[PDB]
């Protein structure tokens, strides 16, 4: 998957996870006021997205030690908003909701019907991932917290044509510095990667199967 990209150009490599929801069924979203039904695959169930967001947040918080120093993802990641540590690049469907549990829960509706919710936002954002403003009543941005668009074909798997709603897998990608010319900083990044591998290997959630992708 990320082999073909040159990982992320010559100076960054990617840690990448593929995530499926084996104990979750698909479900129907009915657009308001009228319109054809849109089925959403298992990993786009609202609760599995919340659970995948917790996984993602936990990954961001992983630390490793090398000598007496501490190594965070923020020390090694691609963060294009500013020259100094910042909001790390995470290619994920959760970045359409700015990696926020509350934004994912945003909804507009009356006492009984839903006008707009995460389905509505999703279906807009896969068509306009750089948008700062959903055209629906939510008016939420699509842009990821790292300051760039997340293209839908990079963060979803197992869908037909461009029906991203029918995805059977989520793909999560963190670019990190390869540090080809800096030996001391590469060792720190590799220390972090070892903790990342451990974290993923020991992560317990019956609702998710988490795998590393084949390079
Ligand atoms: C991937 O991409 C597409 C995303 O748009 C999917 O196409 C859509 O599929 C749905 C059905 O899943 C179509 O919705 C309508 O369904 C109703 C029937 O609704 C229910 O009611 C009857 C009983 O009255 C029940 O027996 C049925 O089983 C349903 O539970 C029909 O009346 C409509 O004519 C229509 O079929 C969408 O129209 C369709 N969208 C488009 C643009 O064609 C596609 O299914 C996905 N592919 C896979 C493999 O998952
Ligand atoms: C996001 O943009 C939309 C554009 O539709 C704004 O919503 C409405 O836009 C119309 C079109 O000119 C205005 O007449 C209304 O005043 C806007 N409605 C509201 C409730 O403000 C919306 O303001 C923008 N929001 C953000 C945060 O960018
Ligand atoms: C880094 O990303 C976070 C989101 O994870 C940004 O924080 C949001 O900032 C907006 C600014 O109006 C607030 O409305 C949100 O409530 C904030 N969200 C959270 C979860 O705190 C932050 O601004 C980004 N930093 C940079 C430098 O772009
Ligand atoms: C696995 O999924 C289940 C179902 O979403 C989670 O457990 C709770 O299930 C009850 C009963 O259906 C729901 O009312 C709750 O919404 C779920 N809990 C929460 C906090 O939302 C369960 O937590 C998931 N497992 C893990 C490890 O996250
Ligand atoms: C190569 O490493 C040195 C420090 O050892 C650093 O000053 C320099 O900026 C690095 N080169 C690049 C291209 O980042």
Curated annotation (Swiss-Prot):
Disulfide bonds join 77-88, 125-142. N-glycosylated. Residues 1-215 are lumenal. It comes from the Eukaryota. Changing residue 82 to P: In NPC1; late infantile form. Glycans are attached at residues 61, 68, 87, 133, 166, 181, 207. Changing residue 127 to Q: In NPC1; late infantile form; Common in Japanese. It is found in: Late endosome membrane; Lysosome membrane. Belongs to the patched family. Intracellular cholesterol transporter which acts in concert with NPC2 and plays an important role in the egress of cholesterol from the endosomal/lysosomal compartment. Unesterified cholesterol that has been released from LDLs in the lumen of the late endosomes/lysosomes is transferred by NPC2 to the cholesterol-binding pocket in the N-terminal domain of NPC1. Cholesterol binds to NPC1 with the hydroxyl group buried in the binding pocket. Binds oxysterol with higher affinity than cholesterol. (Microbial infection) Acts as an endosomal entry receptor for ebolavirus. A cysteine-rich N-terminal domain and a C-terminal domain containing a di-leucine motif necessary for lysosomal targeting are critical for mobilization of cholesterol from lysosomes. Interacts (via the second lumenal domain) with NPC2. Interacts with TMEM97; the interaction may decrease NPC1 availability to the cell. Interacts with TIM1. Interacts with SLC38A9; this interaction inhibits cholesterol-mediated mTORC1 activation via its sterol transport activity. (Microbial infection) Interacts with ebolavirus glycoprotein. It is linked to Niemann-Pick disease C1: A lysosomal storage disorder that affects the viscera and the central nervous system. It is due to defective intracellular processing and transport of low-density lipoprotein derived cholesterol. It causes accumulation of cholesterol in lysosomes, with delayed induction of cholesterol homeostatic reactions. Niemann-Pick disease type C1 has a highly variable clinical phenotype. Clinical features include variable hepatosplenomegaly and severe progressive neurological dysfunction such as ataxia, dystonia and dementia. This is NPC intracellular cholesterol transporter 1. It comes from Homo sapiens. The lineage of its organism: Eukaryota, Metazoa, Chordata, Craniata, Vertebrata. The chain holds residues 392 to 606 of 1278 of the full protein.
């Amino acid at each position: 998957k990320e082999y073909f990209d040159q990982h992320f150009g010559p100076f960054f490599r990617t840690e990448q996870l593929i995530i499926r929801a084996p104990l979750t069924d698909k479900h129907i979203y009915q657009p308001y006021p009228s319109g054809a039904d849109v089925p959403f695959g298992p990993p786009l169930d609202i609760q599995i997205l919340h659970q995948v967001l917790d996984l993602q947040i936990a990954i961001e918080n992983i630390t490793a030690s090398y000598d007496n120093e501490t190594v965070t993802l923020q020390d090694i990641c691609l963060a294009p908003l500013s020259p100094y540590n910042t909001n790390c690049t995470i290619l994920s469907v959760l970045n359409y909701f700015q990696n926020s549990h509350s934004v994912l829960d945003h909804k507009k509706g009356d006492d009984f019907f839903v006008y707009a919710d995460y389905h509505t936002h999703f279906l807009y954002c896969v068509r306009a991932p750089a948008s700062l403003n959903d055209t629906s009543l939510l008016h939420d941005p699509c842009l990821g917290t790292f300051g760039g668009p997340v293209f839908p074909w990079l963060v979803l798997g197992g869908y037909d044509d461009q029906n991203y709603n029918n995805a059977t897998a989520l793909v999560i990608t963190f670019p990190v510095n390869n540090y080809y010319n800096d030996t001391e900083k590469l060792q720190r990044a590799q220390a972090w990667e070892k903790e990342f591998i451990n974290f993923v290997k020991n992560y317990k959630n019956p609702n998710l199967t988490i795998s590393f992708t084949a390079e």
